Symmetry: C2
Subunit: 154 residues, 2 copies
């Protein structure tokens, strides 16, 4: 039973935390952005041009749920699932994790556009690598924080 896809690991640094030592909201999203870039390295998307490493993707839209504070020095990693894709868009879900705590710290659903240099289609090879990764998701935990909308409690 194969482990989840981990795309990115880092240690929370002092320039990402507030006075009280908690990871600022935007820097959870930064860690996920770096994860998106690493996912593009893995599938070699536009690897030989300035579009490499996520540079050819424009994030259209993202939701993020923050379930837990993350303190200075915490070692964290990102898990990433591909929810869907079409000729030029990728639908992805990142979750943030740490050792010894078995629920997500944060999760984000995102839609990304492949852009020319104005959008550009995914080539046959990219599609094949995306399908390969997707096939390897049969064991993954289903994405919880999907289709989310904000409201004050009644």
């Amino acid at each position: 039973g194969m482990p989840a896809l981990i795309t990115y690991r880092t240690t929370v640094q002092e320039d990402w935390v507030d006075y009280n030592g908690h990871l600022r909201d935007a820097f959870y999203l930064l860690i996920f952005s770096y994860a998106t870039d690493a996912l593009m390295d893995r599938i070699g998307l536009d690897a030989d041009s300035r579009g490499q490493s996520g540079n050819s993707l424009f994030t259209l839209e993202a939701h993020i749920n923050y379930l837990h504070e993350v303190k200075l020095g915490t070692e964290v990693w990102v898990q990433t699932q591909i929810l869907g894709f079409d000729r030029k868009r990728l639908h992805v879900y990142h979750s943030l994790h740490r050792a010894g705590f078995d629920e997500v710290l944060a999760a984000s659903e995102q839609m990304l556009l492949h852009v020319d240099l104005q959008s550009a289609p995914f080539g046959h090879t990219t599609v094949c690598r995306l399908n390969h990764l997707v096939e390897q998701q049969e064991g993954a935990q289903a994405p919880q924080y999907m289709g989310r909308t904000i409201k004050l409690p009644a």
Copy 2:
């Protein structure tokens, strides 16, 4: 007819952009985070403690729509509306703008929790300042990017 509330202004710096000179997705959210902090300075929330300047707020959840790329050196500002609040939560909407272009570059709906030092109620004075700001929103453009959900085009 009174102008919109501007909470934050900055110039996009080289450490926020990708190889192609475009603002990375997470750094739109960083600019909005700083805007949230400045909003808390304006209403003086926990001004005399380590909770000052947004430190006593935990972002629970956020959506962000990215309508336009933002290039290196662009002077941008944030507009902020208070959509609602209860005893301990603030519902806010930030939009990103630049001179000479009259649609939003990006927008984000967020829900934030006031936390003790575990949550804490807003005091009478905070509520009065929040109501004052809200009253000044009669002229504001209605928030467009609300209740948004992600989907691939059919």
